[PDB]
Amino acid sequence: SGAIYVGNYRVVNRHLATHNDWANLVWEDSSRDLLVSSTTAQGCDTIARCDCQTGVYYCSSRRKHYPVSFSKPSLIFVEASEYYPARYQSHLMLAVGHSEPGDCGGILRCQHGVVGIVSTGGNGLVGFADVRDLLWLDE
């Protein structure tokens, strides 16, 4: 689990969105595994606007933050899971790092701010849904 709280937005994995998220929906995209809802309170996270390929992510299954090198946002084939059939997921970045299914939502960050959230993984890999291209999160 986990979310980004920037301005009056809450960014979560679409597969983990609650009823309140759907009832306060701003934007969702199944192909990216992302959903954004509106919040009453202002958040403290800032979004990175950069092309960093190194950063640090939070892994809840280890209660630890790890440094990682990650690929550029791309279209990658993701195996079938309890929440989606096998399909191509867009705007996904891959890295070598530990992950388990419930690690989804953990933040990946760089020197500039939040880069994205854990969305996929397995066998010593971890994938992150990028949010750096969503410029509207800043206003």
Q: Which residues are annotated as a binding site for Zn(2+)?
A: 50, 52, 110, 112
Q: Where on the chain is the footprint of ligand A1BS2 (CB under 6 A)?
A: 15, 33, 78, 81-84, 89, 99-101, 103-104, 118-122
The one catalytic residue among 59, 91, 103, 104: 104
Nearer to ligand A1BS2, 28 or 112 (CB): 28
Task: Report which secondary-structure segment, H or E, holds 114.
Answer: strand 113-122
Does 15 qualify as catalytic in the annotation?
yes
Q: In degrees rounded to 5, what are phi and psi of residue 105?
A: 105, -20
The contacts of residue 55 (CB under 8 Å, 6+ apart) are: 67, 68, 70, 108, 109, 110, 115
Three-state DSSP class for residue 76? strand
How far apart, in whole angstroms, are the C-alpha atoms of residue 107 and residue 95? Answer: 14
The one catalytic residue among 15, 45, 65, 98: 15
Residues 103 to 122 in contact with Zn ion, rule: CB under 5 A = 110, 112
Name the residues annotated as catalytic.
15, 33, 104
Residue ranges that bind Zn ion, judged by CB under 5 A: 48, 50, 52, 110, 112
